[PDB]
Amino acid sequence: PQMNYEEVIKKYRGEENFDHAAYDWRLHSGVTPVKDQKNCGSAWAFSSIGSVESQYAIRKNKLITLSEQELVDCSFKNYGCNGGLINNAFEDMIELGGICPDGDYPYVSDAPNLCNIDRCTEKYGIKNYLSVPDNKLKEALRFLGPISISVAVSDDFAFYKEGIFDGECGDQLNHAVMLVGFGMKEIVNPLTKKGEKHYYYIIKNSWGQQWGERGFINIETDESGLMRKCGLGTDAFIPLI
Ligand SMILES: O=C(/C=C/c1ccc2c(c1)OCO2)c1cccc([N+](=O)[O-])c1
């Protein structure tokens, strides 16, 4: 079973209020390096692993890079390079008794590979995972950390280079990414000649560092963070170590 969000957020937030404007885990030792999935539909493994890596960095100040390949090979609830679910991934991490660091189990993508849970002496596990309600993404980011989220990607998304992306959404939820924070940029309109506050979510994508902004993409949101473009965060899970 998963955990109750309201019971967990009471524990990590308390009564403490926060700034809805800008916050980014990359600046507070909460975001591990950007990785790549070449010719493989294993985003589900990159998105969930990365969230675990983040929790070790946040809760234990332990930078550990874990094996997506072990998840691709050994996650039996999911279909490696054919697609999977973030929650099933977390269920299988618990069942497997954790994952080997990617130093002991490297990523070989679509290349055929067999599952071997004994590639290392010490595995890195999780206690459980939590489902984040679509209206509490900004609060969950701020007090719990980076979230494994689903998103609907369009071909325009693959052509993203910099700034904030909007209005080019996929037909269905096809990709798994990590929500690493939120921000705001005040921009004076060239027409009205008046200043406007432009809020955005900061997302970590597993398409290498050559993609977008150092492997990251900023997506338009509002001050509240209720605005979820391309169904971002429809599926929102955060592991707890
Ligand atoms: O795994 C993918 C490829 C992503 C990708 C990699 C490099 C790129 C790119 C997209 O655009 C430019 O360079 C990918 C993602 C979503 C859907 C499908 N699919 O055809 O079923 C493949």
Residue numbers in the entry: -17 to 223
List passages from the publication reporting this PDB structure.
Mature FP2 is a 27 kDa papain-type protease responsible for cleaving haemoglobin to small peptides, with 93% sequence identity to FP2′ and 68% to parasite falcipain-3. As well as having haemoglobinase activity, FP2 is involved in degrading the erythrocyte skeletal protein ankyrin in a process necessary for red blood cell rupture at the end of the parasite intra-erythrocytic cycle. Similar to other members of the papain protease family, FP2 comprises two distinct sub-domains with primarily α-helical and β-stranded composition, respectively. The substrate cleft and the catalytic site are located between these sub-domains.
Crystals of recombinant mature FP2, lacking the inhibitory pro-domain and with the catalytic site cysteine substituted by alanine for increased stability, were soaked with two previously identified (E)-chalcone molecules, EC54, which exhibited the most potent purely competitive inhibition among derivatives in this earlier study, and EC48. The FP2-EC48 structure, resolved by molecular replacement, revealed two FP2 copies per asymmetric unit of the crystal. Both protein copies exhibited bound EC48 inhibitor (see below) and had nearly identical tertiary structure, with root-mean-square-deviation (RMSD) of Ca atoms below 0.1 Å. EC48 locates in a position distinct from the FP2 catalytic site. Analysis of the structure suggests that EC48 binding is mediated by hydrophobic and π-stacking interactions between the benzodioxol group of the inhibitor (demarcated #1 in the inhibitor structure) and the W449 sidechain of FP2. Further, the inhibitor ketone O (#2 in Fig. 2a) is oriented in a manner that would allow hydrogen bonding to the FP2 C282 backbone O and N, and the Q279 sidechain Nε2, although the distances between these atoms (3.7, 4.3 and 4.4 Å, respectively) suggest any hydrogen bonds would be weak and mostly electrostatic in character. In addition, the structure provides a mechanism for the observed mixed inhibition of FP2 by EC48, as the molecule occupies part of the substrate binding cleft, thereby competing with substrates, and locates just 5.1 and 7.5 Å away from the FP2 H417 and C285, respectively, which comprise the catalytic dyad. In contrast, EC48 occupies the middle of the substrate cleft via its nitrobenzene group and binds to the rear of the cleft via its benzodioxol group. The structure shows that EC48 binds only to the rear of the FP2 substrate cleft, thereby mimicking interactions formed by the L2 loop of naturally occurring, protein-based inhibitors of FP2.
